Enzyme design. Structure first.
Site, PDB file in Angstrom:
ATOM      1  N   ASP A   1       0.320  -7.923   1.770  1.00 56.28           N
ATOM      2  CA  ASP A   1       0.700  -6.526   1.708  1.00 56.28           C
ATOM      3  C   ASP A   1       2.212  -6.379   1.795  1.00 56.28           C
ATOM      4  OD1 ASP A   1       0.552  -3.706   1.690  1.00 56.28           O
ATOM      5  OD2 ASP A   1      -0.475  -3.573   3.635  1.00 56.28           O
TER       6      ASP A   1
ATOM      7  N   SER B   1       3.678   2.407   8.158  1.00 59.44           N
ATOM      8  CA  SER B   1       3.471   1.381   7.115  1.00 59.44           C
ATOM      9  C   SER B   1       4.761   0.912   6.471  1.00 59.44           C
ATOM     10  CB  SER B   1       2.582   1.951   6.015  1.00 59.44           C
ATOM     11  OG  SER B   1       1.254   2.166   6.485  1.00 59.44           O
ATOM     12  N   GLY B   2       4.934  -0.406   6.319  1.00 64.56           N
ATOM     13  CA  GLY B   2       6.126  -0.953   5.665  1.00 64.56           C
ATOM     14  C   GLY B   2       7.379  -1.065   6.503  1.00 64.56           C
TER      15      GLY B   2
ATOM     16  N   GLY C   1       1.770   6.271   8.659  1.00 57.78           N
ATOM     17  CA  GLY C   1       3.152   6.681   8.412  1.00 57.78           C
ATOM     18  C   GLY C   1       4.208   5.642   8.763  1.00 57.78           C
TER      19      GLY C   1
ATOM     20  N   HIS D   1       0.822  -1.239   0.000  1.00 58.37           N
ATOM     21  CA  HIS D   1       0.000   0.000   0.000  1.00 58.37           C
ATOM     22  C   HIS D   1       0.855   1.289   0.000  1.00 58.37           C
ATOM     23  CE1 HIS D   1       0.135  -0.369   4.483  1.00 58.37           C
ATOM     24  NE2 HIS D   1       0.111   0.964   4.449  1.00 58.37           N
TER      25      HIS D   1
HETATM   26  N1  LIG Z   1      -3.069   0.650  14.125  1.00 57.08           N
HETATM   27  C1  LIG Z   1      -2.086   0.192  13.313  1.00 57.08           C
HETATM   28  N2  LIG Z   1      -1.270  -0.688  13.804  1.00 57.08           N
HETATM   29  C2  LIG Z   1      -1.948   0.739  11.959  1.00 57.08           C
HETATM   30  C3  LIG Z   1      -0.659   0.746  11.407  1.00 57.08           C
HETATM   31  C4  LIG Z   1      -0.414   1.259  10.145  1.00 57.08           C
HETATM   32  C5  LIG Z   1      -1.455   1.772   9.383  1.00 57.08           C
HETATM   33  N3  LIG Z   1      -1.190   2.302   8.131  1.00 57.08           N
HETATM   34  C6  LIG Z   1      -2.179   2.959   7.275  1.00 57.08           C
HETATM   35  C7  LIG Z   1      -2.742   2.027   6.248  1.00 57.08           C
HETATM   36  N4  LIG Z   1      -2.656   0.706   6.312  1.00 57.08           N
HETATM   37  C8  LIG Z   1      -3.278   0.243   5.177  1.00 57.08           C
HETATM   38  C9  LIG Z   1      -3.701   1.311   4.423  1.00 57.08           C
HETATM   39  C10 LIG Z   1      -4.357   1.328   3.104  1.00 57.08           C
HETATM   40  C11 LIG Z   1      -4.468   0.154   2.349  1.00 57.08           C
HETATM   41  C12 LIG Z   1      -5.098   0.168   1.110  1.00 57.08           C
HETATM   42  C13 LIG Z   1      -5.630   1.342   0.614  1.00 57.08           C
HETATM   43  C14 LIG Z   1      -5.544   2.508   1.359  1.00 57.08           C
HETATM   44  C15 LIG Z   1      -4.919   2.503   2.602  1.00 57.08           C
HETATM   45  N5  LIG Z   1      -3.319   2.442   5.097  1.00 57.08           N
HETATM   46  C16 LIG Z   1      -2.758   1.752   9.898  1.00 57.08           C
HETATM   47  C17 LIG Z   1      -2.993   1.276  11.184  1.00 57.08           C
HETATM   48  O1  LIG Z   1      -4.250   1.247  11.752  1.00 57.08           O
HETATM   49  C18 LIG Z   1      -5.381   1.716  10.989  1.00 57.08           C
HETATM   50  C19 LIG Z   1      -5.344   3.209  10.818  1.00 57.08           C
HETATM   51  C20 LIG Z   1      -5.660   3.806   9.602  1.00 57.08           C
HETATM   52  C21 LIG Z   1      -5.625   5.185   9.481  1.00 57.08           C
HETATM   53  C22 LIG Z   1      -5.263   5.931  10.585  1.00 57.08           C
HETATM   54  N6  LIG Z   1      -4.970   5.387  11.778  1.00 57.08           N
HETATM   55  C23 LIG Z   1      -5.007   4.050  11.865  1.00 57.08           C
END
Ligand SMILES: N=C(N)c1ccc(NCc2ncc(-c3ccccc3)[nH]2)cc1OCc1cccnc1
Length: 222
Positions: A85, A176-177, A174, A41
């Protein structure tokens, strides 16, 4: 990363910062001097990879920048479910290894015995801001049965769960990855989790790196 603290300066030589059009986008893990592993992603235009960084707001003598010459998303990545992913990034300029730039070895055993785990990144902190200095937190792997109850019908064999029962230490937007490091090996990649971030009940969900040994090796060798 929520409820953590600043990393030790020398503890994260494998950490990459990924940028798109100047925006801080994602984390990544250096696994080979020509390759960085990240979440599928994080695929965005003209990715720029920064290695050897600790504080994003200042120029550091150890930092190294590279554009990406190839982005290889897993063929079975499903954006709707976050299944599989994972993405490999080939660097234009191979990493010049130093004390602050080193690859991290992969965990190859899906049945690996319990070791000490940690996460790190420049993602959103508890206050809701993006920190200049990289954050770190110790977390533990959560049983597949507990994770399945937290997210019914959403957890596949290509995902691992991890969190912290005490403060809810968790990865966030932020991060992510970025790497989930267990016993000095790469065990997972930051993928998804709860909103707001916090893992006391709904643990963070990570790409299960042990499942991708053959695909990673075949991609790097082709
Ligand atoms: N709580 C966590 N451990 C967590 C860690 C990382 C992420 N990354 C964001 C993210 N992951 C996947 C996508 C994505 C995939 C496909 C299409 C568009 C977007 N975006 C999110 C997380 O939890 C949800 C979350 C979302 C947003 C704001 N806060 C928390």
């Amino acid at each position: 990363l929520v409820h953590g603290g600043p990393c030790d300066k020398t503890s994260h030589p494998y950490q990459a910062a990924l940028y798109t059009s100047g925006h801080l986008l994602c984390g990544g893990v250096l696994i080979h001097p020509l390759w960085v592993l990240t979440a599928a992603h994080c695929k965005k235009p003209n990715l720029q990879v920064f290695l050897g960084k600790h504080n994003l707001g200042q120029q550091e003598s150890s930092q190294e920048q590279s554009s990406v010459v190839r982005a290889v998303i897993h063929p079975d990545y499903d954006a709707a479910s976050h299944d599989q992913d994972i993405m490999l990034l080939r660097l234009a300029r191979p990493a010049k290894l130093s004390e602050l730039i080193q690859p991290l070895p992969l965990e190859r055993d899906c049945s690996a015995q319990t070791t000490s785990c940690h996460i790190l990144g420049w993602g959103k902190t508890a206050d809701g801001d993006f920190p200049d200095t990289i954050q770190c937190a110790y977390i533990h792997l959560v049983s597949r049965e507990e994770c399945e109850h937290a997210y019914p019908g959403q957890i596949t064999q290509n995902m691992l769960c991890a969190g912290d029962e005490k403060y809810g230490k968790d990865s966030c937007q932020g991060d992510s990855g970025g790497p989930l490091v267990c016993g000095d090996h790469l065990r997972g990649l930051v993928s998804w989790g709860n909103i707001p971030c916090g893992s006391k009940e709904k643990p963070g969900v990570y790409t299960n790196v042990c499942r991708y040994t053959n695909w990673i090796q075949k991609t790097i060798q082709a």
